[PDB]
């Protein structure tokens, strides 16, 4: 039954502007 | 009751669903802690029953009669709160349980985990177990009182010497609703013969026999008279009228099944 078959770049690097 | 419902006494329901009632009490801030909730449950406060009725919705239970001879000896139902101290059981599931109401008792079980509730709802409910695994015959078939009612309903007219004292050398209704309305107004009996205008295809079970008598008119129209229906045909036109000789009982049975099908279709 139901038991069958076992059931960070790009940051701190932005454009300074 | 519905075929998928059962009735539980207040005491059995409050015992079985006690933890869920405690959760319902605490969740809506009506109980400070578990102990206060249990004290409220012991006092039979009127708000305990609202929470019990709320938490019993959608939570199935398992019924079981003592001599479980096959798998239909335990089935799953949707519990509802009923007055008294007895378990309310549907009449059509008694044959599967082999139960009659002369002293029999049943045990009730509550699936707790979501997996068990899903199993009970999707595998053990009565509306998906209409066939017996032994041979494949239906198990929820009307019996006894219902069978007698259907037999009386579909037992047609008295015929022959049981209808007329002497050798014979009936109303016409536009639709079945007119016939049933006339029956309600005591104009006709349950088994008195009548002619019903038929505007569908020939679908009446009858003996495969030629007409008793054909009344052919010189203008072209001819009437074919069978044992249970009259058919009017013409050679000039393609018209074809059908009148069924029946009773209010056959009409009622056919309309009951047809309306059940149509209402179930419309509800979805």
């Amino acid at each position: 039954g139901t038991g069958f078959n076992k059931g960070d770049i790009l940051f701190y690097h932005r454009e300074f502007c | 009751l519905s075929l998928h419902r059962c009735g539980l006494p207040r005491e059995i329901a409050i015992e079985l669903f006690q933890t869920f009632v405690i959760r319902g009490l605490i969740r809506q801030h009506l109980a400070s802690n578990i102990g206060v909730a249990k004290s409220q449950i012991r006092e039979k406060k009127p708000i305990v029953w609202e929470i019990l009725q709320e938490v019993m919705q959608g939570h199935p239970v398992l019924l079981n009669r003592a001599p479980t001879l096959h798998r239909l000896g335990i089935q799953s139902f949707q519990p509802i709160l009923v007055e008294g101290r007895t378990i309310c059981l549907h009449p059509l599931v008694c044959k599967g349980f082999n139960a009659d109401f002369d002293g029999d008792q049943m045990a009730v079980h509550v699936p707790l985990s979501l997996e068990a509730q899903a199993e009970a709802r999707l595998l053990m409910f009565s509306h998906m177990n209409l066939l017996s695994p032994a041979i494949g015959d239906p198990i929820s078939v009307p019996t006894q009182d219902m069978l007698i009612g259907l037999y009386v309903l579909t037992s047609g007219t008295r015929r022959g010497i049981c209808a007329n004292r002497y050798n014979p050398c009936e109303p016409f209704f536009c639709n079945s609703y007119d016939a049933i309305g006339a029956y309600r107004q005591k104009r006709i009996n349950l088994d008195s013969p009548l002619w019903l205008r038929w505007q569908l295809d020939q679908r009446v079970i009858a003996s495969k026999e030629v007409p008793i008598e054909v009344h052919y008119e010189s203008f072209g129209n001819y009437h074919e008279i069978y044992a249970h229906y009259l058919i009017v045909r013409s050679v000039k036109k393609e018209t074809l009228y059908i009148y069924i000789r029946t009773t209010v009982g056959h009409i009622s049975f056919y309309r009951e099944i047809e309306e059940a099908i149509q209402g179930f279709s419309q509800a979805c």
Binding site: T2 | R23, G58, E115, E119, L200, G263, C268
Partner: protein
């Protein structure tokens, strides 16, 4: 098959039945007295039985269906614990969502109440 009627409009032949089907007249008729029946079906929750049968028409194995429904309900309860257990049941929500995913509109988790309850405190007494 191309033909323009001198004004830029293209004239084309419409397709028609051009034949008799006796199943049309006899089948497109409606029963008029099932209002109470439909209302009672909705009240007791047989539409969910129809939905459950419909969902299993696309499942090769029903045990796998039950396991998947239970897993989805478990995810529902884990993500939003407080929303379930009362008027909203997780398994009913899963069933309604799976029916709604087919494009068939259903009330959420088949949650319904009685509009005719005469104020707070009154409990319906079932007539056995």
């Amino acid at each position: 098959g191309i033909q323009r009627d001198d004004n830029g409009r293209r004239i084309w032949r419409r397709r028609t039945l051009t034949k008799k089907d006796d199943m049309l007249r006899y089948k497109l008729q409606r029963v008029p007295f099932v209002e109470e029946q439909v209302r009672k079906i909705k009240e007791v929750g047989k539409v969910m039985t129809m939905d459950i049968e419909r969902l299993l028409l696309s499942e090769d194995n029903r045990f796998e269906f039950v396991n998947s429904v239970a897993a989805e309900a478990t995810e529902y309860v884990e993500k939003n614990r407080d929303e379930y257990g009362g008027t909203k049941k997780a398994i009913f929500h899963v069933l309604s969502n799976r029916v709604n995913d087919l494009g068939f509109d259903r009330p959420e988790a088949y949650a319904e109440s009685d509009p005719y309850k005469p104020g707070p405190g009154y409990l319906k007494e079932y007539y056995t």
